[PDB]
Amino acid sequence: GAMEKFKTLLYDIPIECMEVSEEIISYAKLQLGKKLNDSIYVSLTDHINFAIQRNQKGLDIKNALLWETKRLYKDEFAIGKEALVMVKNKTGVSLPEDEAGFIALHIVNAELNEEMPNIINITKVMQEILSIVKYHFKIEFNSLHYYRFVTHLKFFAQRLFNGTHMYHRAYECTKKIQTYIEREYEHKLTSDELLYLTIHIERVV
Amino acid sequence: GAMEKFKTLLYDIPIECMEVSEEIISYAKLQLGKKLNDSIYVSLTDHINFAIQRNQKGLDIKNALLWETKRLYKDEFAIGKEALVMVKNKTGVSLPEDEAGFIALHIVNAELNEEMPNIINITKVMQEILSIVKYHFKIEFNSLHYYRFVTHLKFFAQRLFNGTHMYHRAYECTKKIQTYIEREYEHKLTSDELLYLTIHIERVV
């Protein structure tokens, strides 16, 4: 019964959506080699259809985390950009760069086995940390250890939202971050979390 | 081919998930009578499974917008709460109140024909407006015209993120809101948008 009800929902998903989405997924896997949760298939397919339809209604698609996405998930954004090319050639529809950002986040989601809400929080925490650091040491980030630093932040933030666990100038920076995260997300960094941050901030700078 | 590939993905969705989700949807429709986009079916089913599995791995589920959700989407949060009862009796699993918040947002999503990222932005703008107003007139909101005000904010914010269009003390409040939205979302309120806000803020107070 259950199974049949759901079977019928697939009748509301255009085949071309399934097709272009597979092409994207397939491509993403080659470029990243990273394992993507299979949830990406129905997630992305539902998203593209929605995006295409929304665009066909003359509605705008605004991604409030576009900038962050471009700089924190370089590889994935590159794929998202390509995905819009793939979507243009298969459908003829021109989606905004904002969509490249949304597709990129769907991939990141599948990479971390997360849901959009959490990926958004994870991304904002990463960005806030980068900003606190740059503004604290008055430094300009450019990419070598940047990726390494970012990558560490990504998993640091993920552990922060799921409960997993594991020099003054750098530590004082870390303490500002603690205040930010406690106030915005109601979590207070533990000793190990502070240790982790300090070590890596110190290191990245 | 396309169609078959997707058919196989359903083999990764437990039947009980499909079942409990339908019960939730069915219930929501009676309580709200509002039309829910049918996307809610696969959206919610995928979410519950993910949530249940995440919880079964000992991972925490944190909803950064729980408080906002409780006060801005009263009816939907009520349903989410009930949904956790429904999920407990069908699966025996105790999900946190945070999940009632996530289920509530999935319903709101289906109501507005939106995707999570946008619902999050819409919700944060509504909350910021309420805060700017309360802090501007030094007023305490309690519920009569509150729902009416909130409802207006919800559609105001939605139009703001999709491109749709249409007394000093209240206007000065509206101007602070303009600054906030321009800085955080890069959109500057137009004459009509300011008009709308002023009228309703003035009114709500």
UniProtKB/Swiss-Prot annotation, chains A, B:
Keyword set for this entry? Activator, Phosphoprotein, Repeat, RNA-binding, Transcription, Transcription regulation
- PTM characteristics: Phosphorylated.
The reply to whether RNA-binding figures as a keyword in the UniProt entry is yes
Does this UniProt record's set of keywords contain Repeat? yes
Biological process GO annotation list? Answer: positive regulation of DNA-templated transcription
According to the lineage, what is the superkingdom? Bacteria
User: Where in this chain does the record put each PRD domain?
Assistant: 12-117, 118-205
One GO MF annotation is: RNA binding
Task: Sum up the protein's function in the record's words.
Answer: Mediates positive regulation of the glucanase operon (licST) by functioning as an antiterminator factor of transcription. Prevents termination at terminator lic-t.
Family listed: Belongs to the transcriptional antiterminator BglG family.
Q: What is this protein called?
A: Transcription antiterminator LicT
- Per the record, the gene is licT
**Span of the entire protein shown here:** 57 to 274 of 277
